[PDB]
Design a protein around this nucleic acid. Sequence first.
RNA 1: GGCGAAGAGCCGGCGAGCC
RNA 2: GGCGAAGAGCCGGCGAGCC
Lengths: 117, 117
Amino acid sequence: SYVRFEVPEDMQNEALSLLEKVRESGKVKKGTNETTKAVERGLAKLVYIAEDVDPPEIVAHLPLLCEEKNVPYIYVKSKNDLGRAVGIEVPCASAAIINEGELRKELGSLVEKIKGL
Amino acid sequence: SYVRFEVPEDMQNEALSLLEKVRESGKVKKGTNETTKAVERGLAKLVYIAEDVDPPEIVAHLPLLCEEKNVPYIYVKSKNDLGRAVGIEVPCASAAIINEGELRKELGSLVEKIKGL
RNA sequence: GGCGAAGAGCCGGCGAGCC
RNA sequence: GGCGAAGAGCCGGCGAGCC
């Protein structure tokens, strides 16, 4: 499996709520192709990788590229929750915040919390 | 009809035979999408348009585009004859010789006779 | 009701392969 | 054999639309 570490549920809820609100005033990429290219292009501020993705090879490359580019990434239980948070009626294996909009502080606190684990 | 002039049957046979041999030492584009783009790009020396194409709007733009680009064009009865001559296993609505290989004079003479119509 | 971020369809490049 | 130059599939691009 591609999941490198365990994320507390309340921090996950914080992450998806943040993603929901960011879609309103920022820019988010949704889907593994858009997310990976956004990371590769140097644009991603925070990427989300679902934990129930099968086969794992859809997203298994995503964590290492994110490590090489020093871009924080977080895990969420279900592709359904991530799909709901980006608001595209279907499950979603990975996503990314590209522009934090007006949610400077909330994003900053969240990313400090990911690096702290 | 999108057929701008009448092409004698014997000129059709000469044209398809020459095209047949040209695939071997020259270069031919096959299908309307490739041919139209190649003429528009200015590389095509001579294009073939089947007369039994349906619906006609598939190839109806080619004659005038070829005129705009000053490219000589000839008509052949059936997309079947053109498809066999360009050597595919399905019908073909239009084609083009872009580089004459070893047939410089033959292509030139053919084009003069086409202008003669 | 169906399909769809496990990528919709559309575009550029190649231009005969896929089951 | 079915589909296929009326564009097969591969690559790049946009990134939610098509039945």
